[PDB]
Amino acid sequence: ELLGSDAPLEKVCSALLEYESKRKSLLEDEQDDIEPVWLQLATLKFIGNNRKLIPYKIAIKNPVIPSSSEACLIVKDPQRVYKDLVNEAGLSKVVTRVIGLSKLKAKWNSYEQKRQLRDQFDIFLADDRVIPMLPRILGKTFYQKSKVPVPVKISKGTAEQLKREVVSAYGATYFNSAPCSSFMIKCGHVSNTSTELAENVESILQFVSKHIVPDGAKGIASIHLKTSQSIAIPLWNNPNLKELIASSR
Amino acid sequence: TPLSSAPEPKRRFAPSKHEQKRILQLAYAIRKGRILTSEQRAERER
Amino acid sequence: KKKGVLYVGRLPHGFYEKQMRMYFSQFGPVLRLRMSRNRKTGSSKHYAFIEFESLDVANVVAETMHNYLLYGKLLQCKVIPEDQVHENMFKGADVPFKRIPHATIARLQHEKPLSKEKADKLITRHNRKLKLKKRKL
Amino acid sequence: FKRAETFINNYRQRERERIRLNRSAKNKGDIFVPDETKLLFVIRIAGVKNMPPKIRKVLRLLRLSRINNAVFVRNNKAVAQMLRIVEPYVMYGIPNLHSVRELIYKRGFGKINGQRIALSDNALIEEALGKYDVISIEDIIHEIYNVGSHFKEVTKFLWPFTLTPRKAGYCGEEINELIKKQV
Amino acid sequence: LKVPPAIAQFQKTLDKNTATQVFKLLNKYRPETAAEKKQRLVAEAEAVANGKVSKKPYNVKYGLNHVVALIEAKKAKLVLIASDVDPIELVVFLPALCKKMGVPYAIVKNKARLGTVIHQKTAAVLAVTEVREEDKNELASIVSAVDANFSAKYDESRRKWGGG
RNA sequence: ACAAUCUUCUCAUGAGGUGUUGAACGAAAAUUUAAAUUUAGUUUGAAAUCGAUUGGUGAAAUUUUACCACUUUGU
């Protein structure tokens, strides 16, 4: 309704569940990893002035990061105070390691050391005040292997805020803005059913049209639904994209 | 492998007892006024 | 007499064409110098080839600058034999990589004005391509 | 001779300076612009080889072509922006009336006929600044302290001070203390 | 004259560049002076005299009996032998003991330079046993340099009678 | 002279924070405009032996820019 005064949802997302299921065709270590759902968006005009190395906190109701995924928290000095707060909040099983910024800069200097730290956790969360430093220190070994630290605001440093922020951080999808006209957003996996997947799509679309696309949903060229190896089924096409680009330019 | 199979003494995993001997000796003479404390060392200098 | 060529590897970030020229000229003059850079962005490949007018000057430099502890990197200097030197492998000598900013040039053409005829050409067979995708599905 | 590690260190400083100028110019075009002082003293701390072309041009405009050169400038938006660009290589502070008089009496030298000549006599000052209503060293010092209309002309006539032997950036009233250590 | 290989090896010392980089790491781990040790202990004395738990210290290991015991225990990561010990037989076995125990070792110049690190007039041998996590890469790079600039170099030269 | 200023947060409630080693392997999609940017992912020693792309733009006094990048080379 917001995008084009129409809602061609539900039917396409539900059909995609059967489309990937039909395309199904001893090991010791097993995991519940599922193929992600890639929501492709095309915009009429470029949406990024420059490479922004922070994710978008797209709040969602169906988390794309399972609660079994380990988390690593990066805080400002000293690390002992925030280590005590994490333990007192009951996040020991979630926030496994808390690394102070000075310790992260010093004790992890080699590329192999940075890669070992990167592979030791599934998601990285960072204090909002220390996020601008992580472009350095962490380097290309983090920002290209799908490991972008999350800007979690823990400024006041209290247990309830930590629990709310982590739950909010886990229950959200992220997308790193890049200068282009096309991008993909993680909407979920096959584990999430059709109705939950549809809810994730519309919530992301509202967030995208609000704080990502400068002119809103009117500037959306086309949108498609895709998986790792599935066909990019066209979710929706702008009925007036061709004339809008001609008139704008 | 290391040449010596002798067990590791506990002294290498605990705070030094030689320094603790001196700390108690220094703390004693601080009470007796034999050694000037750091705060009163500065006052005497100026 | 014979123009010796030296290969320098594991260059620390910052030991670039200007820095190598003023340094290696102390041992002996250098007239051409080239360091490999990536096609896409021109970032240094941390390895380079430096020639010398005389093979003897190249040989002595390789002796004193092999396994040099520079910035935590063991600089490697080996003299390349002539049979493995190629004629076209020293083009763009000391050439400031004209790093074309493809991101902005894409934006400029993206933001470049497009007329109705240009938009019609831009549309082309997009509907047909969408129909072809629908037919495939 | 020069070691290889020296050239990389110079390069790293050059790349370090390039980013810093990129910070100050783009998206951070705001200067502190200290108030309560119409005149400030700026001394070039140090410079390195192969310095950025923009920094050298700012130094040439500010007459800081040599290290340990002290020049008095008027507080302005353009001056503050130039000071921010050359902040790493220049230290700024608020001079005092006593410090300014002492500097003029000790190391006060003007530019007469294109040559740096000490203002040991008031006859030269009167002849050089006849149209500026300046005839003695005290009059020039008072005009500089008050930052008058002829202060810019007096500053151009006066050669830069050589306060040879410090922190980087704004120093405030502590810069006047360094003047006592130089004169 | 003609010298045996075990004494000839001490004329081939570490190069100036690698030695200068070695002492940059060593100077981070100097033992605290007699004055600094007294200041630290008296500071803890006042906290005891009035009224009131640390980490393990970090420093470079020195002493001939101490270092040889650390090599035999395989506790030493890097052993730096002085090149001019007045009785040479004091350290004439150290390169062989370091080879047997797999300890990266180097022969550096000016035993006085070694002593300056430890606030002593003279040291026959220095040994780095275990450093802070910040300097793991710096020590690792030095050990690789010592392998190439000292062990890979010479080696065939250290088995030949020198002099003559 | 292996030393130097990469943000350990601001503004205003939202908007910002411009910064990443190289090489190799490897998807399948989208718009731009095959070439181009996005783009599932991965492997690694601050690893390396031709493959430099080679356009735009300025700024000193055409050679000079080691990112000058279109917002595009000395105040």
Residue numbers in the entry:
A (entry chain K): 5 to 29, 42 to 265
B (entry chain m): 213 to 258
C (entry chain o): 102 to 238
D (entry chain t): 51 to 215, 232 to 249
E (entry chain G): 69 to 120, 125 to 236
Question: What did the original publication write about this model?
Answer:
We analyzed the isolated Ytm1-containing nascent 60S by cryo-EM, which revealed 3 major states in both wild-type and fkbp39Δ cells—each state can be further classified into multiple substates. Among other differences, the RNA domain III is flexible in state 1 but stably incorporated in state 2. In wild-type cells, ~20% of particles are in state 1 and 50% in state 2, and in fkbp39Δ cells, the populations are ~65% and 15%, respectively. The accumulation of state 1 particles in fkbp39Δ cells indicates that Fkbp39 is required for a step in 60S biogenesis along the transition from state 1 to state 2. To gain deeper insight into those biogenesis defects, we characterized state 1 in more detail. In the wild-type dataset, the majority of particles (~85%) had density for Ppp1 and associated proteins (state 1B), whereas in the fkbp39Δ dataset, only ~55% of particles in state 1 exhibited density for those factors. Furthermore, in the wild-type dataset, state 1B showed the N-terminal helices of Ppp1 stably incorporated into the nascent 60S subunit, but those helices were less defined in the nascent subunit isolated from fkbp39Δ cells. These data suggest defective ITS2 processing, and in agreement, we observe the accumulation of ITS2 in Ytm1-associated particles in fkbp39D cells. Our data indicate that Fkbp39 is required for the stable incorporation of Ppp1 and of the Ytm1-Erb1-Ppp1 complex into nascent 60S particles, which is essential for ITS2 processing and the assembly of the RNA domain III.
Eukaryotic ribosome biogenesis is a complex, tightly regulated process that involves many ribosome biogenesis factors and spans different cellular compartments. Here, we answer these questions and reveal how the nascent 60S moves from chromatin to the late-assembly compartment in the nucleolus of Schizosaccharomyces pombe (S. pombe). In vitro, Fkbp39 binds DNA and nucleosomes but dissociates to bind nascent 60S particles and to partition them from chromatin through LLPS. This partitioning provides directionality for the nascent 60S to move into the nucleophosmin-rich GC, where its biogenesis continues.
